[PDB]
C-alpha cells in the first residue's frame, strides 16, 4: 500500500535534522499526491486541486538536500530546476517548457507518467522583482519568468518535442497537462527579515515612548521568518498571483550548535565520514572527539553560512596535516583533539 | 436561443458573488447566438483582482457553450520570426476544438487570459529587443478588428492539398481577461484631488481611503492608455466588465455552496481513507477573516485549511480506530486540535 | 575564464554555461573528462555587488553572475551548448553534470583591508575614554 | 542629423555609428559612394561640458571627423550578433557642422567690445539694430 | 502530373531520417523563382530545406514557399517545382537529382 507520512519522515530524518515542519509538509503533500495518482478520477463528483509548496529557509538549511533525498525515496518522476536559467519565451535563455522536457526524459518520454509528477524549482528568490510595483523596464529573468510560470502552476497543456525539433517539421508536439503536477519552490530570500521587522516592530524612533530593541532582544531570522504573510513577500517583490498559486508555505529554522553537532556524525553523508573514507582509501585511520565537534560548531555558527561553514573549519585544520601526511610513512591512525581546532596544538600521530 | 436566466443561473453554481460580470457575459453570448442565426460585434474586457474568478468564468462558459471555445495566454505570444509562438497560433488552437472546421471556427469564441502582462516598456539597453510588448499588441490588434490571417491548413496530415485556410476574425468574438496590478494607483491620481497640510484640506486615512475595487469600478479608457496599452486597442473593445473583492459572506458560500467546494475536496480525501469529516459554521467565519487578511482571493482559503490539517493529516493514516473528525473554531485559532471519533 | 565578460542567461553577454564549453574543447568534447576537470576563475572581485547601489536597478554583470554560479558550483546539470556561440531554446545541448567538477576563484579585492580593520580594530574615538591608535600601530595590508 | 539625439555608449541606444548608416541608406548601401558624400550636422549646440552623457557624445565624433573605419549593418537592420558589419572609411568624408549659438555674442562682446554692461551710462540693445550681432 | 514535387518529398524525408542536413538546389534562371540575385551565383541558388533553416515550411505540387532570413532580414521565398534542379545533402557527398519533366517544357 501507499507509505504513511511517518515512514517518509523517517527516511528524510536520516539525512536532514531540525526540519520537522518542512518534513511534515513534504510528507503530507507526497502522501496526498500518491492518493491522487492511485485513483484516476480521484473523486466521485469532485475535482481535487493541488497545493503547491514553498520552502523559505536560510542558507545551508537543507533546502536542496530535502529535494535530492526525496528523489531517492520517490517513485513518480522527479526533477530539479534553476529559476535563474529560466527566461520568458522568445529569448536566448532557457524556456519554461524545457523544465517539463527534463521530467519527460526521466519517465522514458511517457506522457502519462509526466502528467503526474513532482517538480522542484530552486533559486526562486533570485527571480524576485526588485519592487512591489511593476518594473518600468522588461525583466527577462525577473517578472517575465514569474508571469510565464503562472499558467504552468495553474495547469495548462505544453508542447514538447518527442526526440528532436528537427526530426519533423511540427513533431506533433506531445500535449501534457500540468494541473496535477506538484511544484516545490525553494529560496533564501536574503533581506526578507527586514520586511517582517518593519511590519511587526514599530515605534523605533527617537523618543521616550518609542522603544529600542537594542540588537540583543531582536527576534532571530529563524523565529522571525515564522511570522510571514503574502503581504510581506509583496514588499520584498513578487507577483501577487504567484503567491496565490503557492497556498502552503514552510519555514526552516536556523541550525543551532546541537543540530550542527548531530550533522557531523548522524547523517549518512556526513563531513566526518567523508574525510574518514578519504584517509581510509589511502591506508590511514582517523578518530574524532566530542569536544572537537563542539568547538567546530561554535566557529561554524560564527561564520553565518549554515552547514557549509563546517567544511571550512575542518579543511583549514587538516591543511598542514594532509600536506605532509603522504610524505611520511609507518603511520596508521590519526587523532584530532580540541586543542588542534584552536590551533595551539598539532594532531597526534600513531605509528605502526 | 437560451435566455440569460439559465445562463446566469447555471453559471451561478460555479461562480458566486459577481453580479455585473455575469450579466455582461450572458448578454454577449445571447446577442452572439441571435446574430449567429442571421451586423457587428462587441468585445468584453474583464478587469478584476487576483482570485476573483476570471479564469473560472471562462472554464465554466466552455461547458455551457455549444460552439468552439478556446483559452490562450499572451505570455507565450511573440513577434513573428522569433522562436516563440505567434498570434496566428491562437486561431490554430481554436480549429483543433472544432475539428478544424473553418465555418465553425468563424462562429466560435476566443478568450485570452493574462493580457496585462504585455505592455509597451523601456528600451532595455542590455537586451537586444523587446518582442513581448508593443510588437505583439499591434498584430493582435489587427486580429481584433477582423482580418484574414494565414494559419496551418488544419494539420491533418503532411500534405493538406494546398488549403492555406485564412479565417476572418470579424465575426469571431474576443474576450480579454487579465488582472492589472497597480491600475488602482493610476486611477487614484484622476479621482483623488490630493491632500493638504491645512485644516480645510481633506486627508484620508488608510481605512477611509477607498479600496482598489471601488477605483476599478470607475476605470476609464484614458487610464489604460498611460498604463502601457495602445489607445486603439482599448477602443476596439466597447464593453468593460469589472469585478470586486470578495467578502466574508461570499467566501463562506464558496467553501460549501459550489459543487467543487474546497471543503468537499478535503472531505472526499478523508472519505476515501475510511474517515469522516465535519465542519462548523463558526470555523468557516474565522477562515474567511484570515483568508481576507492575506489579500489573495479565494486561493487564500486553501492556505488556511492546509495549515490547520497539517499535523492532523500527518498522524491520521498512522493511527487506527478512527471513525470521524470534527473541527471547531478553536482549531482554526491554533489553541486546540481536531476532535476524533473512535469506533 | 574571466568573470567580467560573464553575464546571466537571457542577455547578449555570454552565459555561465559557456565556461564548460571551453573545458570540453580541451578534453576533445568528452563528457566524462569534463566532469573530472578543473576550472579556474579570475576577476571574481569585480562581480562584487555595490551596497550603495539600490536594489531597484538589476545588476547582471555582478549580481547575476553570482546567482547563476550557485547551482553550477554546488553541482547541477548544465545544458552546455556544443560550441558556445549562441544558446537557442529550440537547439539541442549536451548535458554535463558538475557534481564533481572543481572551481577555483581568484581576485585582488580592493578595499577589503579597510573593512577588516574597521571591524577588527574599532579604535576610533576622540573622547578621553576612547583609546587613541597611532598610524604606525596599524597592521599591514 | 541632430547632434542632441546622439548618446554615448551604454545609454538608451543612440550611437554615432547610426549617422553613417543614414548616409549609406541615401546611396543604397554603396560604400564607395558614401566616401564622397557630404555629411552635415545640425543643432550642434545644447551639448557641452556641465554621469550624464554631455560632452561624451561629442567625444565619439572625434574619430569620425579625423577619419576612421565604422561598423554598419549589412542592409540597415538592427544590430544582430549572427551577422557581419561592413566597414566604411570616413577619412574622405567632408563634415559640415552647423548650429545656432545663444549667448556666444555676449561672450565675444566682453572680449572685443568695451562696455559696462548693466550700467546707467552703459550701452543697451534697445536700438533694435540686430545687424550688429 | 509532374514528378518533381513527389520525388522531392521522398528525397527530403529520406535524407532527414539519415540524420544528414538536407539542402535544395534552385535554378534562378527559370521564371517563377523568388530569391535575391546577389546571393545566387552561376544561375543557381542553394536554399536549405531543413525545418530549422526555414519557417512555416509547406510543400505542395503547384508551388513550395518558405520563410527564411537572407542577410539577417526576414523574407518570403516561393519557387516553382520547374526551377528546382536537384536535392542533395551538402554535408556529405551523397546526392540525388530530379529527372527532366516533359510537361514543364
Amino acid at each position: 500500500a501507499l507509505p504513511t507520512p511517518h515512514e517518509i519522515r523517517n527516511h528524510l530524518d536520516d539525512y536532514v535534522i531540525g526540519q520537522e515542519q518542512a518534513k511534515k509538509v513534504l510528507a503530507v503533500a507526497v502522501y496526498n499526491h500518491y492518493k491522487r495518482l492511485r485513483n484516476g478520477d480521484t473523486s466521485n463528483g469532485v475535482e481535487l486541486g493541488k497545493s503547491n509548496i514553498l520552502l523559505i529557509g536560510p542558507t545551508g538549511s537543507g533546502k536542496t538536500l530535502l529535494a535530492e533525498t526525496l528523489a531517492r525515496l520517490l517513485d513518480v518522476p522527479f526533477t530539479m530546476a534553476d529559476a535563474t536559467t529560466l527566461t520568458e519565451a522568445g529569448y536566448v535563455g532557457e524556456d519554461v517548457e524545457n523544465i517539463i522536457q527534463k521530467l519527460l526524459q526521466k519517465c522514458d518520454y511517457d506522457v502519462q507518467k509526466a502528467q503526474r509528477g513532482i517538480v522542484y524549482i530552486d533559486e526562486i528568490d533570485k527571480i524576485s522583482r526588485k519592487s512591489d510595483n511593476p518594473s518600468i523596464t522588461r525583466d527577462v529573468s525577473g517578472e517575465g519568468v514569474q508571469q510565464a510560470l503562472l499558467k504552468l502552476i495553474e495547469g495548462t497543456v505544453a508542447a514538447v518535442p518527442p526526440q528532436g525539433g528537427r526530426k519533423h517539421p511540427q513533431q506533433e508536439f506531445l500535449q501534457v497537462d500540468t494541473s496535477k503536477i506538484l511544484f516545490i519552490c525553494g529560496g533564501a530570500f536574503a533581506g526578507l527579515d527586514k520586511v517582517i521587522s518593519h511590519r511587526v516592530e514599530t515605534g523605533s524612533g527617537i523618543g521616550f515612548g518609542a522603544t529600542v530593541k537594542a540588537k540583543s532582544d531582536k527576534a532571530s531570522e529563524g523565529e522571525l521568518l515564522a511570522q510571514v504573510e503574502p503581504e510581506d513577500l509583496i514588499k520584498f517583490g513578487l507577483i501577487p498571483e504567484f503567491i496565490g498559486r503557492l497556498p502552503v508555505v514552510a519555514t526552516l529554522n536556523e541550525l543551532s550548535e546541537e543540530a550542527l553537532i548531530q550533522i557531523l556524525k548522524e547523517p549518512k553523508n556526513a563531513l566526518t565520514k567523508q574525510y574518514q573514507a578519504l584517509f581510509n582509501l589511502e591506508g590511514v585511520d582517523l578518530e574524532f572527539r566530542d569536544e572537537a565537534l563542539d568547538a567546530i560548531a561554535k566557529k561554524a555558527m560564527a561564520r553565518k553560512t549554515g552547514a557549509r561553514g563546517l567544511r571550512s573549519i575542518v579543511e583549514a585544520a587538516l591543511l598542514d596535516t594532509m600536506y605532509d601526511l603522504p610524505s611520511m610513512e609507518d603511520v596508521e591512525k590519526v587523532v584530532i583533539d580540541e586543542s588542534v581546532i584552536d590551533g595551539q596544538s598539532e594532531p597526534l600521530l600513531i605509528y605502526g | 436561443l437560451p435566455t440569460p436566466h439559465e445562463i446566469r443561473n447555471h453559471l451561478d453554481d460555479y461562480v458566486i458573488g459577481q453580479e455585473q460580470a455575469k450579466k455582461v457575459l450572458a448578454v454577449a453570448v445571447y446577442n452572439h447566438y441571435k446574430r449567429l442565426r442571421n451586423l457587428g460585434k462587441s468585445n468584453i474586457l474583464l478587469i478584476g483582482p487576483t482570485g476573483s474568478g476570471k479564469t473560472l468564468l471562462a472554464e465554466t462558459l466552455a461547458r455551457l457553450l455549444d460552439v468552439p471555445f478556446t483559452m490562450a495566454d499572451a505570455t507565450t505570444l511573440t513577434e513573428a520570426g522569433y522562436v516563440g509562438e505567434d498570434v496566428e497560433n491562437i486561431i490554430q488552437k481554436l480549429l483543433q476544438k472544432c475539428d478544424y472546421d473553418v465555418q465553425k471556427a468563424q462562429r466560435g469564441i476566443v478568450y485570452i487570459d493574462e493580457i496585462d502582462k504585455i505592455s509597451r516598456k523601456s528600451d532595455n539597453p542590455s537586451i537586444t529587443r523587446d518582442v513581448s510588448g508593443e510588437g505583439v499588441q499591434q498584430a493582435l490588434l489587427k486580429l481584433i478588428e477582423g482580418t484574414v490571417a494565414a494559419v496551418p491548413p488544419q494539420g491533418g496530415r503532411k500534405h493538406p492539398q494546398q488549403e492555406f485556410l485564412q479565417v476572418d476574425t470579424s465575426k469571431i468574438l474576443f474576450i480579454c481577461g487579465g488582472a492589472f496590478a497597480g491600475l488602482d494607483k493610476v486611477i487614484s491620481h484622476r479621482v483623488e484631488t490630493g491632500s493638504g497640510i491645512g485644516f480645510g484640506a481633506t486627508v484620508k486615512a488608510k481605512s477611509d481611503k477607498a479600496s482598489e475595487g471601488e477605483l476599478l469600478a470607475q476605470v476609464e479608457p484614458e487610464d489604460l492608455i498611460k498604463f502601457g496599452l495602445i489607445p486603439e486597442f482599448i477602443g476596439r473593445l466597447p464593453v468593460v466588465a469589472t469585478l470586486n473583492e470578495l467578502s466574508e459572506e461570499a467566501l463562506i458560500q464558496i467553501l460549501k455552496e459550489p459543487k467543487n467546494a474546497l471543503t468537499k475536496q478535503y472531505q472526499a480525501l478523508f472519505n476515501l481513507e475510511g474517515v469522516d469529516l465535519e465542519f462548523r459554521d463558526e470555523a468557516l467565519d474565522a477562515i474567511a477573516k484570515k483568508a481576507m487578511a492575506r489579500k489573495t482571493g479565494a486561493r487564500g482559503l486553501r492556505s488556511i485549511v492546509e495549515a490547520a490539517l497539517l499535523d492532523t493529516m500527518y498522524d491520521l493514516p498512522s493511527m487506527e480506530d478512527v471513525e470521524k473528525v470534527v473541527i471547531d473554531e478553536s482549531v482554526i485559532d491554533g489553541q486546540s486540535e481536531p476532535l476524533l471519533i473512535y469506533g | 575564464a574571466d568573470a567580467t565578460t560573464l553575464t546571466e542567461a537571457g542577455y547578449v553577454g555570454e552565459d555561465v554555461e559557456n565556461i564548460i564549453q571551453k573545458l570540453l574543447q580541451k578534453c576533445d568534447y568528452d563528457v566524462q573528462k569534463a566532469q573530472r576537470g578543473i576550472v579556474y576563475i579570475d576577476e571574481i572581485d569585480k562581480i562584487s555587488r555595490k551596497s550603495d547601489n539600490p536594489s531597484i536597478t538589476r545588476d547582471v554583470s555582478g549580481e547575476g553572475v553570482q546567482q547563476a554560479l550557485l547551482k553550477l558550483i554546488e553541482g547541477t546539470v548544465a545544458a552546455v551548448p556544443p560550441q558556445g556561440g549562441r544558446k537557442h531554446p529550440q537547439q539541442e545541448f549536451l548535458q554535463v553534470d558538475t557534481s564533481k567538477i572543481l572551481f577555483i576563484c581568484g581576485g585582488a579585492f580592493a578595499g577589503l583591508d579597510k573593512v577588516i580593520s574597521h571591524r577588527v580594530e574599532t579604535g576610533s574615538g576622540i573622547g578621553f575614554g576612547a583609546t587613541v591608535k597611532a598610524k604606525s600601530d596599524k597592521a599591514s595590508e | 542629423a541632430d547632434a542632441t539625439t546622439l548618446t554615448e555608449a551604454g545609454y538608451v541606444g543612440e550611437d554615432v555609428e547610426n549617422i553613417i548608416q543614414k548616409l549609406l541608406q541615401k546611396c543604397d548601401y554603396d560604400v564607395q559612394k558614401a566616401q564622397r558624400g557630404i555629411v552635415y550636422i545640425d543643432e550642434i549646440d545644447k551639448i557641452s561640458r556641465k554621469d550624464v552623457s554631455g560632452e561624451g557624445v561629442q567625444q565619439a565624433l572625434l574619430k569620425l571627423i579625423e577619419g576612421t573605419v565604422a561598423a554598419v549593418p549589412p542592409q540597415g537592420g538592427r544590430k544582430h550578433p549572427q551577422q557581419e558589419f561592413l566597414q566604411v572609411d570616413t577619412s574622405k568624408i567632408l563634415f559640415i557642422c552647423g548650429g545656432a549659438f545663444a549667448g556666444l555674442d555676449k561672450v565675444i562682446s566682453h572680449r572685443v567690445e568695451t562696455g559696462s554692461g548693466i550700467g546707467f551710462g552703459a550701452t543697451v540693445k534697445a536700438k533694435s539694430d540686430k545687424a550688429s550681432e | 502530373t509532374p514528378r518533381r514535387p513527389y520525388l522531392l518529398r521522398a528525397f527530403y524525408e529520406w535524407l532527414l531520417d539519415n540524420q544528414l542536413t538536407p539542402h535544395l538546389v534552385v535554378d534562378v534562371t527559370l521564371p517563377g523563382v523568388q530569391v535575391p540575385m546577389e546571393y545566387a551565383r552561376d544561375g543557381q541558388i542553394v536554399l536549405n530545406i531543413a525545418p530549422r533553416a526555414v519557417g512555416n515550411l509547406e510543400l505542395a505540387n503547384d508551388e513550395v514557399r518558405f520563410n527564411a532570413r537572407f542577410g539577417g532580414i526576414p523574407r518570403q521565398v516561393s519557387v516553382p517545382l520547374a526551377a528546382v534542379l536537384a536535392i542533395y545533402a551538402r554535408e556529405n557527398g551523397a546526392g540525388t537529382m530530379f529527372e527532366p519533366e516533359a510537361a514543364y517544357d
Binding site: G90, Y91, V92 | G81, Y82, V83, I127, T128, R129, D130, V131 | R86, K87, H88, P89, Q90 | H80, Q82 | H23, V35, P36, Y39, A40, I45, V46, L47, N48, A50, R52, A53, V54, G55, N67, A68, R69, F70, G72, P74, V77, R90
Partner: peptide
C-alpha cells in the same frame, strides 16, 4: 547557403 541556417532568432 544564402538563407541563414536558423530562421527563428532569440533576442
Amino acid at each position: 547557403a544564402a538563407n541563414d541556417e536558423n530562421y527563428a532568432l532569440a533576442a
